[PDB]
Structure 1
């Protein structure tokens, strides 16, 4: 897309304003599932994402890989158990998308992560 880096910069300024004004972005971004399909006109799309069930019950119109998986930028994926050293053994683990605020006037930012663990209650 055109003008994209500029838009990324403006969006950064938007989120940094959001935390400054005490209307936090977690009250501005509900989460949908993982997209699988789309038909696009010129600058107008119709994405389609799962909402319940497991991802690979779907059927993508790629015809190279009908099913899919879930991809997360490894730069942000922060594991917890192996981090906290619970001494546990990896079985079925939950998955949490977490936001990190920091508040210092005119000098503030937001950190994102995707956390997995067996812990049902983060707290």
Structure 2
């Protein structure tokens, strides 16, 4: 897309304003599932994402890989158990998308992560 880096910069300024004004972005971004399909006109799309069930019950119109998986930028994926050293053994683990605020006037930012663990209650 055109003008994209500029838009990324403006979006950064938007989120940094959001935390400054005490209307936090977690009250501005509900989460949908993982997209699988789309038909696009010129600058107008119709994405389609799962909402319940497991991802690979779907059927993508790629015809190279009908099913899919879930991809997360490894730069942000922060594991917890192996981090906290619970001494546990990896079985079925939950998955949490977490936001990190920091508040210092005119000098503030937001950190994102995707956390997995067996812990049902983060707290």
Instruction: Tell me the TM-score range normalised by the shorter chain.
Output: over 0.9
**CA displacement at 1:44 relative to structure 2:** 0.0
**CA displacement at 1:86 relative to structure 2:** 0.0
**CA displacement at 1:41 relative to structure 2:** 0.0
CA distance in 1, matches of 2:38, 2:78: 30
Count how many residue pairs are aligned between Structure 1 and Structure 2: 123
CA distance in 2, matches of 1:53, 1:37: 17
Unaligned runs of 5+ in 2: none
1:49-102 Cα shifts (integer Å, max 9, x gaps):
000000000000000000000000000000000000000000000000000000
Other structure's SS at 1:96 match: strand
Map of 2:38 onto structure 1: 38
1:9-34 Cα shifts (integer Å, max 9, x gaps):
00000000000000000000000000
Unaligned runs of 5+ in 1: none
CA distance in 1, matches of 2:42, 2:7: 19
CA distance in 2, matches of 1:6, 1:91: 43
Supply the RMSD in Å over aligned alpha carbons: 0.0
**CA displacement at 1:39 relative to structure 2:** 0.0
TM-score of the two chains, using structure 1 as the length reference: 1.00
Superposed structure 1 runs of 4+ greater than 2 Å apart = none
**CA displacement at 1:114 relative to structure 2:** 0.0
